[PDB]
Ligand SMILES: Nc1ncnc2c1ncn2[C@@H]1O[C@H](COP(=O)(O)OP(=O)(O)O)[C@@H](O)[C@H]1O
């Protein structure tokens with residue numbers, strides 16, 4: 001039979017059968033209970049709208065993501081999300097399909113063990129396998145080397161790989177991602193008068209960020225230009241009218257990636273953690289990693305980031321090496337495409353964690369040889 | 372619109388591939404010509420050594 | 427319209443420029459490589475005649 | 482110990498052709514076909530239908546004027 005390539009993510013759940021080009025169903029991972037009282041009788045009001053249904057009734061819900069930073073903080077809601085994904089968005093019972101979840105690097109063990117225990121006890125799948133979210137993104141590019149920066153919505157991690165041999169001592173995981181950029185944008189919009197507070201209006205700020213923000217090639221020059229002319233002010237229409245005008249908030253929101261001091265984080269930007277991740281590698285594979293830097297994940301879709309990052313790394317790196325940044329147009333679904341490719345391989349067909357194996361060793365089987 | 376963006380993306384993929392190939396070929400030419408000229412210098416030094424041996 | 431034409435023409439020009447530059451570089455690379463081979467072949471015989479002279 | 486992947490045979494970077502070159506032409510041609518058929522179905526039919534509705538609207542205007550005038554003529558007392 002065919003395998004189910006699910007990809008929990010944090011912000012958008014992407015799923016679909018193995019062997020295709022794009023995920024079949026992509027929908028936000030939010031579960032929102034209603035918060036008001038409700039007076040109409042017999043309206044058929046449910047107790048929790050999940051997935052894309054709660055992005056249409058969000059006016060009277062309190063949306064809450066079940067995955068904070070890669071890790072899962074609310075297991076009941078995550079179980080509800082998985083149940084919805086299997087039964088309503090794909091309509092395939094899990095009793096007859098292997099599953100291939102994905103997990104960020106350096107995550108707590110208990111999260112992974114609970115994930116496999118749920119998949120084997122509640123949904124009762126035949127066999128499931130957990131894979132690191134960066135190796136898949138490297139599969140999708142058709143490479144076999146390269147250092148991949150997978151800046152998702154929950155957590156940004158940077159896994160270097162050479163000739164198929166991952167370097168476990170050079171993984172640099174940073175917890176700045178799309179959600180913190182949304183919060184920072186929502187916080188700097190208040191400098192013009194627009195106040196978004198409700199958890200429903202966070203979605204509106206996210207839409208503003210997606211449609212308007214861009215990464216500046218040079219930050220100081222843009223700050224000077226936006227403060228003199230008015231060629232940058234782009235307007236946007238809220239879900240009820242009252243258009244708003246975003247000035248130099250456009251390139252200040254995604255600039256947080258390269259200067260995490262804006263949101264008070266100490267660490268260095270995504271332009272310098274990649275160079276540090278490279279320098280921890282051996283001295284003989286640094287040229288190949290320099291030449292095959294891969295971008296993935298949703299948050300790396302800002303217009304103009306593949307040039308800013310290349311300029312920064314070229315500034316840091318030695319002058320002789322060639323710096324090349326692979327930015328495929330299908331960046332958002334790169335991890336899932338790689339997952340489909342991996343699940344479609346014949347050599348991989350014996351790596352699944354078969355159910356009888358789980359019955360013999362318990363949920364701690366995932367840390368064992370079947371990784 | 373829709374198809375126009377995809378066509379632009381194709382025209383850009385061609386751009387990147389052609390430019391990268393051009394740069395790589397230029398680097399190859401630089402390396403090969405440096406090799407040849409160093410070999411020629413070695414040949415010259417051998418001629419001079421032969422001259423000293425003849426003397 | 428206007429923007430599509432100019433952008434498409436400029437990008438095709440970029441592709442053609444890179445391609446022709448790469449071809450010129452590769453031609454010079456091949457010529458330099460063959461000349462280098464000639465230099466090697468002559469240098470070996472120069473060494474042989476030098477060795478005979480020294481003997 | 483870290484997992485050990487059993488040794489296989491092949492391949493990689495050889496499916497990039499079979500997943501890229503396909504849509505490099507088929508997708509462009511199919512989207513061009515879709516745009517052509519959608520424009521043909523939509524624009525000309527919409528303009529013709531709007532002209533037809535405009536003519537019907539003018540006829541309704543004439544009928545309204547005639548009825549209003551005759552009723553005002555009779556009722557004027
Ligand atoms: N076109 C876009 N431009 C800018 N940011 C985007 C765009 N699309 C998505 N994002 C950001 O990326 C996030 C989605 O990232 P995603 O790759 O789905 O995360 P995950 O790894 O959990 O799947 C969204 O929250 C949004 O903030």
Ligand SMILES: [Mg+2]
Pocket residue numbers: 009010133150152153297298335
């Ligand atoms: Mg991801």
